[PDB]
Design a protein around this ligand. Sequence first.
Ligand SMILES: CCN(CC)CCOc1ccc(Nc2ncc3cc(Oc4ccc(F)cc4)c(=O)n(C)c3n2)cc1
Length: 248
Amino acid sequence: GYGSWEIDPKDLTFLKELGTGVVKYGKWRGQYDVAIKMIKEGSMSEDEFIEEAKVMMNLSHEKLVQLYGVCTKQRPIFIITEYMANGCLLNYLREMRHRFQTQQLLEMCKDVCEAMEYLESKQFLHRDLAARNCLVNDQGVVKVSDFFPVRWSPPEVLMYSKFSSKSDIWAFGVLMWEIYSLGKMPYERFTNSETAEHIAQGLRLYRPHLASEKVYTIMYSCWHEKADERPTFKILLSNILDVMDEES
Ligand SMILES: CCN(CC)CCOc1ccc(Nc2ncc3cc(Oc4ccc(F)cc4)c(=O)n(C)c3n2)cc1
């Protein structure tokens, strides 16, 4: 048993499909908006499901998509999370520009940075940080979810498979760039193969027009060739707050 995490499936009402594992929008006990993830039989393993669910049971933060419970005494198994009304951040940046101004781009960055500082403090590596893996709620708050993506990877990952806190740092820099470019694909004119070659040669993503020099300095610091020279999420958060105060 998963203790207080076990949800009675009778308390769920299904309303709309969100993506297809099948994810749906619904309500829990007719009061709370939820997303219901229906893991289809055959995918994953005995141990694989147990790990990932318990990962979500042990991590909790205002800027991380929150697990509400699990339905495991039946097939298919349900995962129930908080509902993020505005969907995927990547689509939001591309399709919902009428809902946010330039000043709010930095706020999106801060939201993600707070999530990552928390994960960092728990010694938990995300390993796939990108706009496509963040969600946006009804108030426009960005939250990290889902805790090969060549375009989000540092040279040591691409060359040596060296994952660390510092590869998450690199990816976060790329995410800032996604936000400030309003959802452009990083290295937009290159293939993954070309991106890898260019990164290793010291090529870096250009400053998006919407990013000030100070904002660019923040994302650029994430891309130091030397992993040990990249900041921590604690440092990035302080930097972001400093720029927020100076630019508003
Ligand atoms: C107009 C077309 N529209 C159809 C209505 C397209 C869909 O637009 C939307 C609209 C709202 C959402 N919101 C939304 N909210 C919560 C979750 C939780 C999920 O499970 C997790 C599982 C693990 C985890 F770590 C975090 C969350 C998950 O998977 N997805 C997707 C979610 N999507 C997502 C997409």
